[PDB]
C-alpha cells in the first residue's frame, strides 16, 4: 500500500486501478492521469469507491472524502471534500507520455517509439505493461486437441470454436497437457515436441503464458567514465589474434557500460571471447536472449578459454537441445554462458550481452536486476533483426526504437564499430554497406563472382498468412541442375511455408531469414517470395544476404532491392 511515484518518485498510497500494472502515482500525477484518460479507479489502502451500500460509483472524479470514508455526490455528508480538485487526488504525502503508455493496446509502432523515447522509469512501466498485455493476449487463443496421430513427425488437430487460431510457425511455442513445450509447421501438419512423447488423441495444448514480474533495475545503469581501467587487470602478453581489439578492450575497462556495433562477420564472438584473454583473472558472464546466441559464444569460448572454468547454465525446465561440452549449471565457474530468462542472481567483473538487436527493454532490465557487474558490454547490430513484437500490426519499428542500447547506437553512435566484414564476398559487403551502414562497412574478401540476382515475381500463394512462390522455387530447381556445386546451398526465404515447399522440391536444408541470424553458410539461395513490408524489410534483407561466405543466388520480387543488389544478373 506504501510506494513511490512511477513518474516523479514522490511517495504515495495512490495506485491506478485501471492500469494493468497498478503503478503507484503521487497526488499531482494521479490527478493528471485520471482527468486525461478513461482511467478513473484509484487505489490507496482502501479503493476510492462510494462506501454507501449498493452504490457503484468507482470514478474518483465523482467521489468525496466524507469524514474518514469516501462517497459520491448522491451519498456525501455536508462536510465532504472532492478527492479530485486543485490539480491533486486526495492521498498521503500530498504526464502526456505516461497516459499514452498506460492506455495503448501495443498494436501501433508509435506505442513502441514512445516506450523507448520516454524517461527511464516510464521505459520500465512501458516494458512491464507491454509484456503483461502480450501474456494476457495469449489467453484469447483457442485450445488445439489431437484428433489423430499419422506418424512420429506428422498429425491432424481439432481447434476450439469462437477463440481465434494462432499462426502455425516455429515462432508460436505452445505447452502440452504437463508434457513439455511443443511447436508446429504446415491436411497433414507437423507436430514437434521438445520432449519425445507418443502423441495421444484427446490431449490438448495452450500457449506458454508466463507471469510478468515487476521491473526494478533500469534498462541501462547510469554511465560512468573512468580515467583508468577499473577493477580489471590486463595482460601485456596478449595473443596477436586479439591485438586489433586491445584499444577497445581498454575502452571497456574505463567505462561502466560500452556498446559494440558489429555488422555481419566483423568479429563480435572473437571480440567477446578475446575480452576474457585480455582481462584473464576477470569473471565474465556471457548472456543473450536465445539459446543459439549463447551456444555461439560457447563454441568460440571452447576454442580459446580453458573448458574447466566454463559453465553453460541450463534452466531446469529444459526446452530445446543446447551446448553440451561445458559443466552444466555451475554458477561459480569464471565463465558462465546463460540466456537472459535463466540468469542466476550473481556478480561479475564483466557482463557481455550479445545479439543486442534481439533484446527488449524487459530483457535489458532483467540483466541489470540479476547481475551486479563492474562493466557491461552490449554487442550486436541495429541493422539486424529485433525480437518479434507479436502485438505490433500497424507501422514498422525502426532500429532506434528496438531497445535503449540500439537507441544509443542509432542516435549518439556506438562506442566501438567493427568496420571490416571477413565473411562475405565483396558484392554482398558493398550492397549492405550502402544499404544500412552509411558505407562504413569494408570488404576483406574479394568479389567471389558467385553472387547472382534474378528479378522473377512468379506467383504468390498463401498457406493462411505465410506465403509460397512455387515458380521462384522452380527457377531455383532449374539453376541447381546447371550449377550442381550449389547443391550444398542453404535455402533461405522470409516465410516458413515457402521453406516447407523448397525443402520437399529442392531437398536443400532450409532456414527463415530470422532463424539464419548469427549463422554463416558457403552458399545461400534466397527467394524473396513476396514484395511485402516483411520481405522488403532492409534489416531482414541485410541478414539474409550476409549469411553467405562464397556464393548467393537472390530470386527477387522487389525492383528496389533487386536494383540495389551489386550482383551479376541471371536470365530466364
Ligand atoms: Zn508524481
Ligand atoms: Zn491508469
Ligand atoms: Zn454513492
Swiss-Prot record:
Residues 1-105 form the CV ZBD domain. Changing residue 248 to S: In strain: Omicron/BQ.1.1. It catalyses: ATP + H2O = ADP + phosphate + H(+). Residues 237-418 form the (+)RNA virus helicase ATP-binding domain. Changing residue 399 to S: In strain: Mu/B.1.621. The chain holds residues 5325 to 5916 of 7096 of the full protein. Plays a role in viral RNA synthesis. Multi-functional protein with a zinc-binding domain in N-terminus displaying RNA and DNA duplex-unwinding activities with 5' to 3' polarity. Activity of helicase is dependent on magnesium. Binds to host TBK1 and inhibits TBK1 phosphorylation; the interaction with TBK1 decreases IRF3 phosphorylation, which leads to reduced IFN-beta production. It is found in: Host endoplasmic reticulum-Golgi intermediate compartment. Changing residue 348 to V: In strain: Theta/P.3. Zn(2+) 11 binds at residues 5, 8, 26, 29. Changing residue 372 to C: In strain: Omicron/BA.2, Omicron/BA.2.12.1, Omicron/BA.2.75, Omicron/BA.4, Omicron/BA.5, Omicron/BQ.1.1, Omicron/XBB.1.5, Omicron/EG.5.1. Zn(2+) 13 binds at residues 50, 55, 72, 75. It comes from Severe acute respiratory syndrome coronavirus 2 (2019-nCoV). A ribonucleoside 5'-triphosphate binds at residues 262-269. Interacts with nsp8 to form the replication-transcription complex (RTC): nsp12, nsp7, two subunits of nsp8, and up to two subunits of nsp13. Interacts with host TBK1; this interaction inhibits TBK1 phosphorylation and decreases by 75% IRF3 phosphorylation, which leads to reduced IFN-beta production. Zn(2+) 12 binds at residues 16, 19, 33, 39. LRR repeats lie at residues 208-228. This is Helicase nsp13. Residues 419-572 form the (+)RNA virus helicase C-terminal domain. The lineage of its organism: Viruses, Riboviria, Orthornavirae, Pisuviricota, Pisoniviricetes.
